[PDB]
Design a protein around this ligand. Sequence first.
Ligand SMILES: *SCCNC(=O)C(C)(C)Oc1ccc(Cl)cc1
Ligand SMILES: *SCCNC(=O)C(C)(C)Oc1ccc(Cl)cc1
Ligand SMILES: CC(C)Oc1ccc(Cl)c2cc(C(=N)N)sc12
Ligand SMILES: CC(C)Oc1ccc(Cl)c2cc(C(=N)N)sc12
Ligand SMILES: [Mg+2]
Ligand SMILES: [Mg+2]
Ligand SMILES: [Mg+2]
Ligand SMILES: [Mg+2]
Ligand SMILES: [Mg+2]
Ligand SMILES: [Mg+2]
Lengths: 236, 236, 5, 5
Amino acid sequence: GAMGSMERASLIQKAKLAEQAERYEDMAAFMKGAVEKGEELSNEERCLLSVAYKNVVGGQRAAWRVLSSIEQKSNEEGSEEKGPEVREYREKVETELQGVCDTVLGLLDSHLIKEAGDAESRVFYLKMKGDYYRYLAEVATGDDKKRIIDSARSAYQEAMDISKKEMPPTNPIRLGLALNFSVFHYEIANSPEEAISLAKTTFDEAMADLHTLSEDSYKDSTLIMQLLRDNLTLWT
Amino acid sequence: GAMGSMERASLIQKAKLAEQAERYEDMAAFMKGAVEKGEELSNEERCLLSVAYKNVVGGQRAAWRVLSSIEQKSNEEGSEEKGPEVREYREKVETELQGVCDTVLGLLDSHLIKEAGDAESRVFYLKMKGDYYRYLAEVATGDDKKRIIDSARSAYQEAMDISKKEMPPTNPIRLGLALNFSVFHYEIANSPEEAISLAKTTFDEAMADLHTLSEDSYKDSTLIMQLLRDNLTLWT
Amino acid sequence: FPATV
Amino acid sequence: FPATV
Ligand SMILES: *SCCNC(=O)C(C)(C)Oc1ccc(Cl)cc1
Ligand SMILES: *SCCNC(=O)C(C)(C)Oc1ccc(Cl)cc1
Ligand SMILES: CC(C)Oc1ccc(Cl)c2cc(C(=N)N)sc12
Ligand SMILES: CC(C)Oc1ccc(Cl)c2cc(C(=N)N)sc12
Ligand SMILES: [Mg+2]
Ligand SMILES: [Mg+2]
Ligand SMILES: [Mg+2]
Ligand SMILES: [Mg+2]
Ligand SMILES: [Mg+2]
Ligand SMILES: [Mg+2]
């Protein structure tokens, strides 16, 4: 581990600086180093880990989609053969993306999830596990595609089960989990009805719990509720 | 060279794909590999090389500025000591930036400039040499700072001398060189009057030559002329 | 693309 | 920051 010689607190501090500088690859490397110290993460540190890798893999996904579109257009009838290069470069980006997903899943398995006992930590990490298997599923085509999809589903389902027992319906982690599992249903599992039902029920149950919240909690929860509504509008 | 086994044409093709995917680090790596084939570059290939490295180093410069600002605020009176981490991380980004600049200057010196005989190639490469020494000058503080600044000045001056003899006043390379040398004067050499004079004279001489141009050339030239005017407005 | 967090 | 190309 190239961060092995850096203090945990210094890694966290530099992750925050890297975020301010929009240096998300550095931020992810610092947070990987922090996780590898072996101590549990705080709520804020979980956010730093998630933001870093979400931005890294999000950029990879966007690039993969551009390249995969070009590759598709080059395979249609009437397109001029341009050689192996588009496929090769799409594969290069894909392999890098898969490497990042493997890294995140590795941190979750060794050993974040097994030490996470509170709902706010355990649901967060299980949601992340679902997310990174979902990103692997977006690019998968081989013998293990169904197993990858099922690994995402299983992680999301365990997170959902805990969140419904242990968190109020407005908790932002519970809401974000439902948002993302709904997207999984729609985009990965070919289950648009489940996606829509989950988004609607999540939204409605959150609405009915807003009255219990402070102004600041209300702002946090309604922000994610609007994302649920946005997706419902896209899908209906 | 990690690109040594890839065909030149494949590297150029992948640089174009990387640009479409906004993967500028990859684009720069592909173009470095193409340059290292040893053949001269075409006009379009020079644009690909420049765009790739301009985007890579531009992101590094933006991050360095964020970090250097934080470092400055942490050294003012009344600021709480937070340890070596801000300086360390600013230095990390700075060293990476310097590495990219060294790489570009290395490609120019080995051997792009010495084989560039036409004004459109030679002025372009000398402008790039000025630009990458200017980026080194932005972060320099040591014994060699004056020599770095003078290396930028010398490259820009040679490019200017050729451009004035060999290119019309509306040529976009001539205009872009003048734009950037003017910025060098203002930001690096502490010569705001020279910066303003150069931008104004460049703009006026281009204006007087627009009548010779086609509609498409007119669009290209007036685009850069507006950048000169924008800088003049900032500075006056 | 749909929203995720 | 000023414009450069
Ligand atoms: S934990 C990252 C900081 N939080 C956020 O960026 C927003 C999107 C505002 O809130 C959430 C992020 C992630 C989850 Cl699981 C829930 C809310
Ligand atoms: S060569 C890169 C493609 N050209 C451009 O992006 C713009 C900025 C439109 O034109 C110029 C770039 C660089 C120079 Cl030196 C001159 C024009
Ligand atoms: C986007 C906000 C409202 O979501 C958060 C909630 C709570 C914490 Cl502690 C935190 C730390 C964060 C970061 N460095 N990006 S974001 C964030
Ligand atoms: C921004 C435009 C107007 O400037 C150019 C002029 C000429 C060529 Cl050949 C070229 C190739 C380019 C690229 N792949 N970015 S840009 C560019
Ligand atoms: Mg430590
Ligand atoms: Mg593959
Ligand atoms: Mg259910
Ligand atoms: Mg070749
Ligand atoms: Mg230094
Ligand atoms: Mg002069």
